[PDB]
């Protein structure tokens, strides 16, 4: 993989000597849920600038869905795989 460090993340930094700084851990995120984990189960990345591409597998109590969406200014791409319905391919606006 190759995920470089974006701006606006918060980072452990030792100062290992006089003029030797290093980076150890990461203290931030950008994708969680905000619900009680009995209604949502989010498992996903985010991508690029604007964070507009979700490789999400959001099993709710309803169904198990897979997704590759895109949210752009009125180009709204997607990719969906259910279990009740199955393989979708959509374009919206």
């Amino acid at each position: 993989q190759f995920i470089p460090l974006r701006n606006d993340d918060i980072i452990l930094i030792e100062i290992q000597s006089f003029t030797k700084g290093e980076i150890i851990e990461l203290i931030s995120n950008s994708a969680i849920s905000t619900k009680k984990a009995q209604q949502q189960l989010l498992q996903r990345q985010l991508l690029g600038s604007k964070e507009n591409c979700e490789m999400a597998y959001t099993q709710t109590s309803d169904s198990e869905t897979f997704s590759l969406t895109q949210v752009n200014e009125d180009c709204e791409n997607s990719f969906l795989i259910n279990d009740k319905k199955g393989i979708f391919l959509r374009y919206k606006s």
Binding site: K85, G86, I87, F88, L89, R90, Y91, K92, S93
Partner: protein
Amino acid sequence: KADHIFNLEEQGLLIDIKDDSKGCTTKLESSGKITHNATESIESSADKQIIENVKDSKISITEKEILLATKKSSIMLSEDKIVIKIGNSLIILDDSNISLESATINIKSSANINIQASQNIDIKSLNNSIKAD
């Protein structure tokens, strides 16, 4: 400002490309059915053949010759030679050559049978050639 779907289910593809007023909705359901729909028009061009077959029930299209055929029955819309068959009754339609072959001919009317020409007329016959009033 439109919307687009492309499915797959137990039944089959349910594909549409829809504006609010219009669309193009094609299926391939699992029940042996194929359908296609549109709101203006369907066109389909080729180079040699456009053939549809259900147990010798053809509509073929070549460059020149349109066959509309089943068993014992075939309109041949050939170039300059229309042939309309039931054995045995041909109707050739040419530039200047109409035959109406058969074994038997029956002809009815109710007001007129106007039979004109611009040259001679010959009605050759056998045992009877009758009339009434």
